[PDB]
């Protein structure tokens, strides 16, 4: 387990200048205040919480002390790509007219 | 009674008597 | 409802049209394929409580087209805090017998959280009303759902803009007026429970629902709208609720 583990902090995957805490067949990126990301890759907007614009959120939106704000969905929809966007899981979902899609 | 109505769907009925 | 178009066929596929014995009672949401909110005042009256239907797909009551569905309402639930008689919570979450079957011309309508409704919803000025009005009446679209577009009022704007020295009613945290002022176009008598839907990022979503007011389309007064946004808690947790026996029930509140 420890021997086929191996040093994965070694493709330095934090950026921004964060520290990379090797793990398990995975590593750890610890960012920056003003960064954020599995990779620390993107840059906090301090603005980005949902009062404003709903945080882009297309539909639902939740704020997280220390964490950019998550976009959701509602039942019958799914969170998109973008993390901003829904579509739909089943065929008639709320708020949504037949006759026009 | 919506029924009672002349100018009414009469599927309307099944929900009166 | 008053100065409305018809609604296109299938461009109000939430609304409902709650009949107690084969008549009209009033109009209701329908949310997902069992429950349906309405007004709280419809159930003000009701003696024959076995007898309660609730059509869905409707649109002309004067014809048919295979999109109606009947399906009966197990319960009524409303506020613990409801008081008959009153304006303030005006509002009630029904179960029906057998849930309905969404096709494209009977959809459920998108509830939003208690946070989504009153960060955003709460400040789009204009949503929709719909709903069939008094089905006696003569007129020849007498029978046709029919919607209308009205910008919402916060609240104070509505205490002030209101001839409101002419018997000023409460006008509480539960509700929002909506509408305008001149008299031309508002909700009215057998529009009750009906959706006060609110489109946003391309979904539609629930705010309100027909509630009173003073006078339909009266000049100085506006259309008074039960605001969903407060219930909403309480119409969530009811839907997880173990199904009770009698058809009446009155929920605690909150
Ligand atoms: C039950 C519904 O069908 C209906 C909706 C009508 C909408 N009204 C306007 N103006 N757009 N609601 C009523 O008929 C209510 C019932 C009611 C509710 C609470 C207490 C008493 C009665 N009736 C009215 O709104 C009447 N205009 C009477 C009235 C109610 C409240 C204040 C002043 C007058
Ligand atoms: C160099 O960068 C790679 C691509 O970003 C990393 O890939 C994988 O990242 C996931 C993240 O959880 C897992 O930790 C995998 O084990 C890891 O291989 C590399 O880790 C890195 O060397
Ligand atoms: C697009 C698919 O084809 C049609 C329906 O039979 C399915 O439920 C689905 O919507
Ligand atoms: C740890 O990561 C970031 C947060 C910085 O403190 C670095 O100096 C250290 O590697
Ligand atoms: C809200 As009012 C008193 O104008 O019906
Ligand atoms: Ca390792
Ligand atoms: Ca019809």
New binding site residues.
């Given amino acids: 387990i420890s021997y086929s583990d191996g040093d994965?902090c070694?493709?330095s995957?934090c950026q921004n200048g964060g520290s990379c805490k090797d793990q398990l067949?995975?590593?750890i990126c610890f960012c920056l205040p003003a960064f954020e990301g599995?990779?620390c890759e993107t840059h906090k907007d301090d603005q980005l919480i949902c009062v404003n614009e709903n945080g882009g959120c297309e539909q639902y939106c939740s704020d997280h002390t220390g964490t950019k704000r998550s976009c959701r969905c509602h039942e019958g929809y799914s969170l998109l790509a973008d993390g901003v966007s829904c579509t739909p899981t089943v065929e008639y979902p709320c708020g949504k007219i037949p006759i026009l899609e | 009674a919506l029924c009672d109505d002349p100018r009414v769907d009469r599927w309307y009925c099944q929900f009166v008597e | 409802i008053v100065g409305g178009k018809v609604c296109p066929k299938g461009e109000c596929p939430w609304q409902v049209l709650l009949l107690v014995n084969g008549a009209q009672l009033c109009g209701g949401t329908l949310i997902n394929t069992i429950w349906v909110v309405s007004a709280a005042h419809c159930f003000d009256k009701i003696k024959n409580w076995r007898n309660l239907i609730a059509v869905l797909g409707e649109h002309d009551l004067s014809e048919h087209d295979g999109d109606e569905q009947s399906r009966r309402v197990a319960q009524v639930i409303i506020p613990s805090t409801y008081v008959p008689g009153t304006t303030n919570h005006d509002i009630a979450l029904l179960r029906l017998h057998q849930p309905v079957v969404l096709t494209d011309h009977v959809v459920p309508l998108c509830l939003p959280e208690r946070t989504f409704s009153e960060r955003t919803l709460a400040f789009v000025r204009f949503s929709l009303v719909s709903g069939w009005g008094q089905l006696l009446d003569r007129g020849a679209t007498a029978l046709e759902l029919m919607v209308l577009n009205v910008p919402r009022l916060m609240t104070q704007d509505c205490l002030q803009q209101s001839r409101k020295v002419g018997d000023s009613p409460n006008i509480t945290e539960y509700m929002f007026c909506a509408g305008y002022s001149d008299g031309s176009k508002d909700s009215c008598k057998g529009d009750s429970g009906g959706p006060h839907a609110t489109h946003y990022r391309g979904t539609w979503y629930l705010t309100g629902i027909v509630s009173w007011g003073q006078g339909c389309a009266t000049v100085g007064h506006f259309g008074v709208y039960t605001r969903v946004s407060q219930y909403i808690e309480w119409l969530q947790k009811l839907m997880r609720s173990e199904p009770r026996p009698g058809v009446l029930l009155r929920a605690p509140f909150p």
């Fill in positions: 994965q070694a493709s995957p067949q995975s590593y599995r990779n």
